[PDB]
Write an enzyme that holds these catalytic residues in place. Structure first.
Site: not given
Ligand code: FAD
Ligand code: FAD
Lengths: 650, 650, 175
Positions: A578
């Protein structure tokens, strides 16, 4: 210079994660602007290991490459953090998903929404709970999670025990125990245990439950008409075949939307203080430049938002000049600072009995519980010195409790402890930190192209070295330094003091069984319990034995026991995934999510959160993206969209 | 499309590591062709932490970022390998330097040249020892290492003990003990110990010494006229201010040479079967294309040569098509296969005595010994079933022995064992594997841009699971699977059986001290010694206890002891950084170093070695580059250049 | 060149450097400041006008920094020059702290002439493109036509004499 890939528009959204798709979808739905999404990833709509929820546990893994999706460089970015000086200098790799849907394509699918108190006491103005709770409702309606579809008697026993001891915690007048909720009153907030007992909703609309013991979570899976479950995630819902063409165009209603699948972005071409263009590398290896007319949006996750900002030109001018950044725009020495994350030490329980198989039945994982069987969310322990001022009048969420069958410590610890996963009279309990103290930061290392591993510093379980200063006014830095280790030890005691009510409940629930904590060792917990109840609120003086001046053999016992106990949370634990708070509100952005020092860029992913929410950080990022929809568009449209309007599924 | 960076030429060398600079230098010296070098890195000629040899140990580290150069993303690439199924699924990060001079800018500076026998028995035709030994002489002359500048009596005691027991190993007629060299005869090859004793050169020109006990190594440092030592490495020597302008041009003699500092290369634009161009990303983020007329050279290291090849189009067509490579050239399913590396389990010794400080003096590290104080290189143990056929008639290098003051196990092991680095009656001994058995492979994960972490698989200490097959014809797969663990156990015994001769030598060398191995535990080694000498060549049946059918309590003792002992080499050890054999001769390239299926590209770094040499793998890569100079140019010029002609230093 | 004509320029330079204070307490400073205030008490009385601990821009109260936690800091280099006699605890040194944790030196060449402003070949960059800096050039004297300076010569690192014309003015900052 003939590049026909002219993709000039007015809005560009970068990174289709838990917040990118929500924004792109609801942004092209409610307006006519020309929207572009860039993700650098294909759509795993057909992969069995993705769409099947049980594939998370490695059901479709080839026998020669038994690794799942977080450890797979084809599915997830692999950043490693510099040696943790608090954990014997052990570097760790935590992933961010690389696909449409971001980390939601590879996660465990849980829906903690976070307590009400946190958004009221830790967020800026305009982000208090009553300003956003509607957005949380919107996202949970857009997903429609489900509950567990299988009863079990262990949940009943544990809830029984917790209500038994919460009875006493309600009396005795102390105000800050971990099973007291102030929005309910004298009655405990413990779910009833019998047939036809109602269900306490953890993610309730009005946030009454900030401490409550329940029986099931809300996972993001749906059941198909056939009988098979699938995964319902951000890309699945907001960006599916019904809404976007295979060529990346939207369909009809959303014809003003463009999505490019494999396009890694490098930086933001930036004229004056006005962002004007963006470049990216396709799957040949070509650089394509696209114009921006109106605004640029960054949804690239916690680890890679500050990084793309720093390559762009915003950060510490001295540092970026040092490593060779040619173009410098705004001198903000706070970009990439204040990184936060959860942390979950692990313990396991032994059951002694000839026919204990009858006790542990119906604990296996199905796509509806995903091995989660409770149990509740608790508050501060009685004896934790690091509590905010409001603790007397408001209840805060501290620990998230989880129970699971089997053993979950790491393999080396499994061998060391003498207990393995083959045998079946053992199960795991987890006391997660939601208010985890340590803070770190992110620094790029080379101004060439987006690198998988930038400098990430995160030191958790550090130690305090006493000075020659008089003891009187050096204590309140020992407190600040030793906060997290104290929190972990108190979580251990909290779990420990449950098993005896569990003993009684099992004895008079029709079970002649015995419950006992074998990891960490039995004696090493009984000694901690005795030390706590014999030393009171000054139990944590004994982390440093050179300042207590207590040379009594009892004091030496206490010091040695705490020394040994300090070892388990360092190794026998699991850093969560997270990541948050890289460009928080105030530090790097204002309350309208715009980047200080520039007029037409915003960051709207989980990095922009000024505090980690009360649980798993998925709903929060989607909420931030949803609110950003309103702030960009100007007037509240997603605000009172009727809850019966939901995206159709394909 | 106005890009004035037109850098079209006839030779392009990619990656200025231990082999790139040698080739570029001696290639522009002996011809008139237009040469270009691309490295993606600046020149650390002024950095104190680089140029000062002692900076390797963290003398110039800011107090908040105490990490050295292998763990620093600004100095080194950071690739992590997938979970090691033999080491409790612990991922590891091993680095490749990112600067002019490659890994030589960040390494420990040792000059083992490797035995003679290896290049005679394990390399193709044209690469036998007598074809290259001149090139080894050339590189060691171009560096001019030095020896230790400080005596110590521990070296004398240990050499005394080794000669004492080599006396007996010379008798008893057994042919394959670890202290028998066949190129000397009845006399042991143990350096003499008294004042005016001559020095045995390990890296001798005619390769007589393949097993020998000495007192000092040859590190790549020089002493300046002032009194301070500096580091003498590939970039320091072949590419310094005297030879290349600050703008990247060569000077006079070498005016036909171009070096670009920060330029990350992506792939090889490739017309037909003829490579024609190359593109790279500068420090804006721009793509620059350069023409190639005559040939392309790849010197990008073990981990990143197969990767750039695969992005280019050479590899497994099914796989590269699967992950989305658009252009496919040659279908070689062996690219990126056969990865090899060394491995060094660690043990430490306790000394009991009231004034043992007199025993351990003059052991601290100086820039001439870098904490190395011996001791010798040994052959096969008597009881190792995995020996080649030639073992009866030729002596092979198996173990490289090292002695060092202080403790060198990992911090968690330090805490576990109860012995720390503060106290000063302890020292470390290391039995490195040079013939380490396990093999792995490298696969890219995304066809966009050079990524820091591609799929790297390396499983070392795996276990054997018996089947229902009759015991008779399943043994010779148990042998192949259990080779490395057997090797480590035999290294443990070899070190163990030295300390008693050391006891005797110390007793009658003027020392009333006691020597003892405390890690791994004392008893757990005495039991192994007894088991070995009571069970003979069939001691390794007992790794799997279900097949020995020996239910005697002695057999159960042996099985349990080997089970426990199998734990130490997994955790208490150190994977080295000698990556090699990714595109070896025959597997991927011919004996003239050209890539199969194409006419004008070669790979000439350490990845092209068809076997790991007899020690630290720095001289070998430089030798390969030097020989490549001749193969490209056509006639032997660097061949009999007089040894008095050496590059001048600035 | 009276104070009120230049004090702005002093502000300009101290702003261009941004020094820092001491980052470490010590009790010897407290003891010594204590003693000086003790005897400055008496020097304030007795009516003599020219003792060494009397400042006239403050009055009866001594200009001695307070000694306890949360005591304010007396700025020696104050903008309006009130403190010409004052007992303090720390100076202002010209060092900066980097993001890593290491201090460096902030001096004239560091600030006004660094890689951001001048090329490695001695040219200025963009804004300052009309600037030339020659690194190793020892000057000898000023070729001087009539009462009008016209040229200057210098010796480079071969040992050659190079002559350069001056059109408008010559400036001497050689210490
Ligand atoms: C191992 C694991 C366990 C998890 N367990 C839980 C859980 O128990 N409960 C829960 O609620 N959530 C869980 N999650 C999810 C996590 O807690 C959140 O969902 C996450 O913070 C999603 O937020 P975000 O969209 O900002 O990040 P992300 O989903 O990572 O958004 C980033 C996106 O931007 C893209 N990107 C990155 N860099 C670039 C670049 N340079 N150019 C273009 N695209 C790029 C990536 O490919 C991705 O699509 C887990 C995640 C993981 C990996
Ligand atoms: C931690 C460590 C310890 C070591 N200890 C020893 C020791 O005890 N003894 C010893 O003899 N040697 C030691 N070495 C050195 C090592 O064993 C060899 O010197 C190494 O194999 C050098 O071989 P090379 O030139 O082929 O690899 P490298 O020196 O790594 O050459 C690769 C070069 O190509 C560049 N490059 C890579 N990818 C790209 C790209 N895409 N585009 C452009 N440029 C690129 C890299 O920056 C680098 O300059 C050590 C090295 C390390 C890292």
């Amino acid at each position: 210079c003939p590049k026909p890939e002219n993709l000039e528009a007015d809005i560009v959204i970068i990174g289709a994660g838990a917040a990118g798709c929500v924004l792109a979808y609801y942004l092209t739905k409610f307006s006519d602007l020309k929207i572009i999404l860039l993700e650098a990833g294909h759509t795993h709509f057909n992969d069995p290991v993705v769409t099947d929820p049980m594939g998370f546990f490695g059901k479709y893994n080839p026998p020669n490459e038994n690794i799942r999706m977080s450890q797979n460089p084809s599915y997830a970015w692999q950043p490693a953090l510099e040696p943790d000086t608090g954990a014997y200098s052990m570097r760790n790799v935590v992933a961010h998903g690389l696909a449409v849907g971001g980390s939601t394509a590879i996660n465990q699918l849980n829906y903690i929404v976070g307590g009400r108190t946190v958004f009221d006491n830790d967020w800026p103005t305009g982000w208090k709970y009553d300003d956003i709770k509607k957005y949380f409702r919107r996202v949970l309606a857009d997903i429609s999670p489900i509950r567990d579809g299988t009863k079990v008697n262990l949940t009943n026993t544990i809830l029984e025990s917790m209500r038994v001891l919460a009875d006493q915690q309600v009396s005795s007048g102390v105000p800050v125990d971990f099973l007291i909720n102030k929005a309910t009153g004298g009655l405990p907030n413990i779910e009833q245990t019998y047939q036809g007992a109602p269900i306490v909703n953890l993610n309730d609309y009005e946030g009454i439950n900030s401490v409550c013991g329940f029986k099931s979570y809300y996972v993001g899976v749906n059941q198909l008409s056939d009988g098979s479950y699938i995964r319902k995630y951000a890309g699945n819902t907001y960006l599916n075949s019904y809404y976007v063409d295979s060529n990346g165009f939207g369909i009809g209603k959303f014809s003003n939307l463009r999505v490019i699948s494999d396009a890694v972005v490098d930086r933001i071409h930036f004229e004056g203080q006005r962002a004007v263009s963006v470049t990216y590398i396709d799957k040949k290896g070509n650089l394509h430049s696209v114009k921006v007319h109106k605004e640029v949006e960054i949804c690239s996750g916690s680890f890679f938002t500050p990084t793309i900002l720093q390559r762009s030109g915003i950060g510490d001018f001295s540092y970026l000049s040092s490593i060779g950044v040619p173009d410098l725009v705004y001198n903000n020495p706070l970009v990439g600072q204040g990184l936060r994350n959860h942390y979950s030490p692990i313990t396991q329980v032994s059951v002694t009995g000839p026919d204990a198989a009858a006790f542990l039945s119906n604990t296996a994982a199905g796509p509806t519980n995903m091995s989660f069987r409770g149990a509740g969310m608790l508050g501060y322990h009685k004896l934790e010195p690091n509590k905010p001022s409001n603790a007397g009048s408001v209840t805060y969420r501290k620990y998230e409790l989880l129970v699971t069958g089997g053993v979950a410590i790491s393999a080396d610890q499994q061998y060391l402890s003498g207990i393995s996963s083959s045998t079946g009279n053992y199960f795991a309990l987890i006391a997660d930190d939601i208010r985890f103290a340590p803070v770190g930061y992110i620094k790029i290392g080379t101004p060439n192209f987006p690198r998988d591993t930038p400098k990430i510093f995160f030191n958790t379980f550090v130690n305090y070295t006493p000075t020659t200063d008089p003891a009187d006014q050096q204590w309140p830095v020992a407190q600040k330094t030793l906060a997290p280790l104290i929190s972990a030890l108190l979580g251990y005691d909290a779990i420990y003091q449950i098993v005896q009510q569990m003993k009684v409940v099992a004895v008079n629930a029709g079970f002649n069984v015995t419950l006992q904590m074998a990891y960490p060792p039995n004696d090493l917990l009984v000694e901690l319990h005795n030390g706590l109840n014999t030393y009171g609120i000054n139990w944590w003086h004994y982390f440093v034995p050179s300042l207590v001046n207590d040379d009594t053999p009892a004091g030496k016992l206490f010091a040695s026991t705490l020394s040994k106990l300090s070892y388990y949370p360092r190794s026998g634990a699991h850093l969560d995934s997270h990541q948050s708070c890289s460009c928080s509100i105030g530090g790097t952005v204002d309350t309208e999510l715009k980047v200080i020092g520039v007029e037409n860029v915003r960051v709207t992913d989980l990095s922009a959160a000024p505090h980690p929410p009360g649980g798993n950080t998925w709903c929060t990022a989607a909420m931030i993206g949803a609110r950003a929809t309103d702030l960009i568009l100007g007037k509240p449209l997603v605000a009172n969209l009727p809850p019966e309007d939901v995206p159709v599924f394909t």
